[PDB]
């Protein structure tokens, strides 16, 4: 076809990351492009993980023997930190402490679930300048959401960041409100 | 020298030039119209104007789209936007200025490419703006 | 321990669930609608109007 094809470009492009924040998360995954947080444990014991499943990329997926300004990297940046155990009060301000003076405009982190078994904590931790919303958010945000499986009551993060529109690094150069001249 | 005639989905590519003499609508000439009631609707691009000497016409018009009514406007505008377009860079001007004056004192969607187009359907509703009958 | 189940919904299963429920057999992707929009934007399917 061609319709049933360019979908298969993406719907193959999709299940991969189902297979990536499952197997390379503890090994520090950020996003296919392979963007990453930590990058040795992705190779392996000089070869243990590099090819442990490229050899399974084929003998599952029809092949042959031979062929911090991102939220999805920061919403798991320290999702470990929780299921390892710290205060959910100051640890959350640390990450928005972190990215904000990394020349970044705005950040926001929420944690939802049972802090103590009730109608369930939902407290929210913001810092900065977060445009939202219109079209300028698709350009300027990253947001990820990862279910956190601790032993008594699932919880869940919703991190958001935003790109400094000044030091944009691609696309528009500032907020579409922009006004300036010289005296 | 060519134009379009657009009411809706029906766009009549209007051939005009000093041609042959026929009055066609995709098919057969002025012969084949067959509203036979609104038959008189394409009868206002050349009656408050010169009545004839158009054995040098290119009145081919193919209305592919729309409907029977959709395309009756499409050809009188096809003529409009193409007959008035003859005296634009081919022949004198102060009869284009002085019979498109005779059009607009009676104007009925002649050189006005009709801005009015349908609206999309909104779910939970019979058609676009109507809704389902409220249940309590 | 098996009998004809060639066609129909018992035949087709969700890629992410094997959920026979909510199938969308359009464009050869074969996922359920509960299931798809979660994994929507990463296929280039976006929202404009």
């Amino acid at each position: 076809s061609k319709k049933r094809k360019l979908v298969a470009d993406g719907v193959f492009y999709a299940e991969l990351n189902e297979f990536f924040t499952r197997e390379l998360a503890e090994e520090g995954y950020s996003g296919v492009e392979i963007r990453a947080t930590r990058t040795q444990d992705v190779l392996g014991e000089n070869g243990r993980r590099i090819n442990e499943l490229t050899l399974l990329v084929q003998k599952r997926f029809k092949y042959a023997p031979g062929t911090g300004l991102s939220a999805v990297a920061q919403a798991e940046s320290m999702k470990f930190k929780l299921l390892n155990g710290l205060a959910i009060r100051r640890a959350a301000y640390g990450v928005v402490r972190y990215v904000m003076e990394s020349g970044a405009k705005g950040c926001e982190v929420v944690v939802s679930g049972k802090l103590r078994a009730a109608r369930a904590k939902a407290m929210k931790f913001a810092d900065g300048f977060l445009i939202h919303s219109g079209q300028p958010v698709n350009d300027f945000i990253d947001t990820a959401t990862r279910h956190v499986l601790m032993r008594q009551g699932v919880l869940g993060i919703k991190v958001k960041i935003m790109r400094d529109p000044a030091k944009s690094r691609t696309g528009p150069k500032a907020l579409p409100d922009a006004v300036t001249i010289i005296e | 020298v060519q134009t379009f005639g657009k009411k809706k989905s029906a766009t009549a590519v209007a051939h005009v030039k000093a041609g042959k003499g026929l009055i066609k609508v995709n098919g057969s000439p002025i012969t084949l119209v067959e509203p036979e009631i609104l038959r008189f609707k394409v009868y206002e691009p050349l009656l408050l104007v010169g009545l004839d000497k158009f054995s040098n016409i290119d009145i081919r018009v193919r209305v592919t789209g729309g409907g029977h009514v959709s395309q009756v406007y499409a050809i009188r505008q096809a003529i409009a936007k193409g007959l008035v377009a003859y005296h634009q860079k081919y022949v004198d001007e102060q009869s284009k200025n002085e019979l498109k004056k005779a059009f607009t004192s009676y104007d009925r969607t002649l050189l006005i490419a009709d801005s009015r187009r349908p609206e999309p359907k909104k779910f939970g509703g019979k058609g676009a703006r109507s809704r389902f009958q409220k249940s309590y | 321990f098996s009998h004809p189940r060639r066609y129909g919904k018992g035949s087709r299963q969700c890629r992410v669930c094997s959920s026979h429920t909510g199938l969308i057999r359009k464009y050869g992707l074969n996922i359920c609608r509960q299931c798809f929009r979660e994994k929507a934007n990463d296929i280039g399917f976006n929202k404009f109007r």
């Binding site: 061609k2 319709k3 360019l6 979908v7 | 779910f123 939970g124 | 969308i24 359009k26 464009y27 609608r33 509960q34 798809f36 929009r37 929507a40 296929i43 280039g44 399917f45 976006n46 929202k47 404009f48």
Partner: peptide, 30 residues
């Protein structure tokens, strides 16, 4: 060429409660 939008109209909710709100995703080829 003419572009053809690929449209998938699915209802916005996992369950069957709320107002009956749909939403069309597009794939825009070229």
């Amino acid at each position: 060429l003419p572009t053809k939008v690929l449209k998938i109209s699915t209802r916005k909710t996992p369950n069957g409660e709320g107002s009956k709100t749909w939403e069309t995703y597009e794939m825009r080829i070229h």
